Amino acid sequence: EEIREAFRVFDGYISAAELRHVMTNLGETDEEVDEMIRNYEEFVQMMT
Amino acid sequence: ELSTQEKSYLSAVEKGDYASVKLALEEAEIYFKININCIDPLGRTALLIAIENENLEIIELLLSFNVYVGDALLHAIRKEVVGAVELLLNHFSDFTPDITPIILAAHTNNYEIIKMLVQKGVSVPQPHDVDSLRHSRSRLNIYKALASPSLIALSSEDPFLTAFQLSWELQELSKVENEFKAEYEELSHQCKHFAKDLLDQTRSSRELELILNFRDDMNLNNELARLKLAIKYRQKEFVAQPNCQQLLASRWYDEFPGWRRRHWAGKLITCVFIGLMFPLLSLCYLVAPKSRYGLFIRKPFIKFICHTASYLTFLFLLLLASQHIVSNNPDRQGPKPTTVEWMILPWVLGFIWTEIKQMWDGGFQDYIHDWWNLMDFVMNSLYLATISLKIVAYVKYSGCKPRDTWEMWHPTLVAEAVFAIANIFSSLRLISLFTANSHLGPLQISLGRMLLDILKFLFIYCLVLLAFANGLNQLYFYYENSEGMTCKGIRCERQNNAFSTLFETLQSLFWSIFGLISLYVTNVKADHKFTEFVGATMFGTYNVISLVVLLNMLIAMMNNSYQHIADHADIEWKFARTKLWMSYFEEGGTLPPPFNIIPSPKSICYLITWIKVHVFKRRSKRTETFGTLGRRAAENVRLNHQYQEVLRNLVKRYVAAMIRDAKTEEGLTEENFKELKQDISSFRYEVIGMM
Numbered sequence: 001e002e003i004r005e006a007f008r009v010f011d012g013y014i015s016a017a018e019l020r021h022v023m024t025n026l027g028e029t030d031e032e033v034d035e036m037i038r039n040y041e042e043f044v045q046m047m048t
Numbered sequence: 049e050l051s052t053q054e055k056s057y058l059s060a061v062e063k064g065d066y067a068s069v070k071l072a073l074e075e076a077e078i079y080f081k082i083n084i085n086c087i088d089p090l091g092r093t094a095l096l097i098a099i100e101n102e103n104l105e106i107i108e109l110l111l112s113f114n115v116y117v118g119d120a121l122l123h124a125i126r127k128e129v130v131g132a133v134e135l136l137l138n139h140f141s142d143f144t145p146d147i148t149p150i151i152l153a154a155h156t157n158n159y160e161i162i163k164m165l166v167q168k169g170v171s172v173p174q175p176h177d178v179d180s181l182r183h184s185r186s187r188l189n190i191y192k193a194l195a196s197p198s199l200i201a202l203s204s205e206d207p208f209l210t211a212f213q214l215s216w217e218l219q220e221l222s223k224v225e226n227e228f229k230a231e232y233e234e235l236s237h238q239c240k241h242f243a244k245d246l247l248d249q250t251r252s253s254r255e256l257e258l259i260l261n262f263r264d265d266m267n268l269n270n271e272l273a274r275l276k277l278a279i280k281y282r283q284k285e286f287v288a289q290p291n292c293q294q295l296l297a298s299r300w301y302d303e304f305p306g307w308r309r310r311h312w313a314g315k316l317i318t319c320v321f322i323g324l325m326f327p328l329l330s331l332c333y334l335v336a337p338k339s340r341y342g343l344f345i346r347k348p349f350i351k352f353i354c355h356t357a358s359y360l361t362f363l364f365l366l367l368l369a370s371q372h373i374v375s376n377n378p379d380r381q382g383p384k385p386t387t388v389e390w391m392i393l394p395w396v397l398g399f400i401w402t403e404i405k406q407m408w409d410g411g412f413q414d415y416i417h418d419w420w421n422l423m424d425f426v427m428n429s430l431y432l433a434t435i436s437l438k439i440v441a442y443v444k445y446s447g448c449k450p451r452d453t454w455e456m457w458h459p460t461l462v463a464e465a466v467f468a469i470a471n472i473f474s475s476l477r478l479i480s481l482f483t484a485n486s487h488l489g490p491l492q493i494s495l496g497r498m499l500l501d502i503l504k505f506l507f508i509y510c511l512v513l514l515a516f517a518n519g520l521n522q523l524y525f526y527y528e529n530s531e532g533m534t535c536k537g538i539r540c541e542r543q544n545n546a547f548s549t550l551f552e553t554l555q556s557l558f559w560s561i562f563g564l565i566s567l568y569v570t571n572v573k574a575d576h577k578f579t580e581f582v583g584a585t586m587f588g589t590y591n592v593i594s595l596v597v598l599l600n601m602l603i604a605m606m607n608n609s610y611q612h613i614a615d616h617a618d619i620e621w622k623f624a625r626t627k628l629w630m631s632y633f634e635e636g637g638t639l640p641p642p643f644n645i646i647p648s649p650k651s652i653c654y655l656i657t658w659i660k661v662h663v664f665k666r667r668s669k670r671t672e673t674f675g676t677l678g679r680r681a682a683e684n685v686r687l688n689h690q691y692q693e694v695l696r697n698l699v700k701r702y703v704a705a706m707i708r709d710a711k712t713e714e715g716l717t718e719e720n721f722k723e724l725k726q727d728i729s730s731f732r733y734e735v736i737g738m739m
């Protein structure tokens with residue numbers, strides 16, 4: 001368990017449209033940042 | 049099975065004639081006076097004859113006149129003819145029924161043929177039965193198909209990993225089959241050469257570091273992950289590559305450039321300096337590894353020097369543990385530890401702790417795989433037994449007793465004996481360091497790689513020893529002869545009762561191989577001369593079998609063994625040296641054993657949390673510890689794309705250097721002569737026809 005805590009980012013379904021800037025506000029393009037997803041509720045499971 | 053009209057037709061094909069072949073083919077339509085797809089006295093169809101000689105023109109005539117193709121495609125694959133295959137694609141057998149065109153094409157490792165078949169969408173099965181040879185042949189054909197370098201270049205998005213898992217599969221399966229072991233071992237060695245030749249095509253250190261530094265992230269750097277994986281697959285010819293070894297050597301001597309100005313004594317003084325210097329060089333890293341000298345031991349070569357210096361000080365304390373300048377009174381049952389023993393004990397704990405640490409990362413999987421690891425495990429177990437026996441002596445010994453009156457099987461004596469055996473193992477264990485030195489390295493490796501033969505042959509030696517011990521005891525069973533033989537046994541001043549029991553007979557038969565036994569052990573306290581004669585004859589037969597037959601056979605066996613472990617004594621030595629180096633690369637047990645047990649600055653913050661695993665504090669590690677966005681994939685994706693581009697370049701270079709160095713560099717066989725002859729013949733026939 002110990003899941004559903006990291007959803008404290010601004011969203012609520014999550015797609016690739018709104019996260020590109022999220023890792024750009026604190027990070028630094030489309031052709032590779034898009035793959036971070038590459039749908040909802042899969043990033044807290046199968047992490048261990 | 050013959051004729052006179054069609055034999056002219058096959059002859060006109062075989063000689064490359066064109067007008068006659070066209071005439072015969074066109075005349076076959078109106079009159080059935082010829083069978084087009086007939087068989088010559090050797091077993092060749094007209095189409096197959098044209099394929100065998102690369103005469104594509106007659107091939108396309110036959111194809112346009114609907115001759116029975118049958119399996120002529122496979123025969124075109126064998127002759128690796130590209131034009132005939134291209135013309136055949138746009139359209140009782142001689143082969144095992146399970147062979148597909150792509151399998152056979154992979155067998156020949158021909159790039160122009162694999163290229164075309166894959167574009168047509170062919171596929172290869174993947175392995176894991178009342179009959180057995182069909183299945184076994186199918187499995188071997190499959191492996192030999194996808195073990196071809198040409199096919200790995202087309203498929204296999206990760207050629208290194210593919211070759212690695214494939215070598216592992218075939219190495220582990222050459223024992224499961226055990227009847228085709230030669231073929232499977234050959235294929236595994238072939239794909240190992242493929243991996244090495246693919247690494248060889250790098251052209252820049254930048255191109256090399258990415259290859260060696262790559263691994264699956266899965267949200268779990270540059271610590272040579274691919275290289276450790278290659279070690280894990282026993283890929284000993286991939287890590288013996290020149291420039292890879294150059295990278296490792298550069299990363300081993302990072303503390304100081306050069307190391308080539310060194311000579312007979314230049315390197316000795318700088319290493320002896322650090323070997324003396326390791327105590328405070330270690331303490332500095334222990335307390336303040338910030339900027340001054342803590343990073344000086346973190347560097348790998350310095351770590352090696354400090355470790356071997358700590359081992360040598362351990363051995364010095366062990367030798368000095370027997371001098372009388374420090375030894376306690378012998379006439380003292382279970383004495384308190386001597387000051388030298390107090391110094392020694394931290395090394396014992398350090399070695400035990402480092403071996404537990406090593407166990408806790410291999411999980412008894414590679415732990416047993418290293419014979420050095422087994423030796424040091426038994427050494428530490430003997431140390432543990434020594435400590436336990438010494439303390440259990442100390443709890444009730446009360447001292448004040450001469451050693452000549454101690455009862456047999458007393459804890460102090462057994463503790464001393466175990467301590468001595470452990471000293472033997474400890475002083476032996478430094479042989480492993482000789483893998484680092486470029487001169488005792490290969491020699492020590494060859495020592496290791498004929499120890500198995502000595503074990504095999506020593507088993508037979510022990511069987512023979514047991515046989516002769518059986519007989520000799522049967523013979524001198526009754527002459528007990530212990531009426532005046534003070535200190536009975538083989539190991540006396542007179543060698544009495546050597547064969548009076550099974551243990552002493554085993555022991556006497558052992559010593560006789562060294563000559564340290566004498567005759568007149570075979571005598572008996574009576575005039576029974578026939579018993580003495582037959583006993584002496586049995587003893588002499590044993591000696592002849594051992595020292596003239598068996599030992600000479602051992603020599604003649606290891607002679608050829610060494611003759612067959614020198615071809616890869618360098619590559620295997622470099623693999624062992626790399627295995628030793630990478631043990632010191634990581635920032636793990638950087639602290640030599642004397643300065644290892646010393647607790648960490650926290651020492652109460654990591655042990656407890658790892659101890660909180662049987663309670664609810666095991667789950668309090670992935671919820672509050674991690675709460676960030678995990679911004680790593682964007683770096684991971686770019687890294688993977690860069691590595692894929694590097695692989696693409698390496699593969700293209702490997703192809704361009706396998707076609708131009710192996711295809712055009714082999715011999716000239718009779719078939720090529722026949723093709724050239726028939727080219728000339730067809731030329732003559734056509735120019736005759738045009739006039």
Ligand SMILES: CCCCCC(=O)OC[C@H](COP(=O)(O)O)OC(=O)CCCCC
Pocket residue numbers: 581584585586587588589592
């Ligand atoms: C292979 C077993 C040979 C017999 C060993 C043996 O003990 O017999 C030795 C006999 C008699 O000597 P002993 O029996 O040993 O006292 O002399 C020889 O025949 C020498 C032949 C020398 C042959 C090398």
Ligand SMILES: [Ca+2]
Pocket residue numbers: 403406420421424
């Ligand atoms: Ca070890």
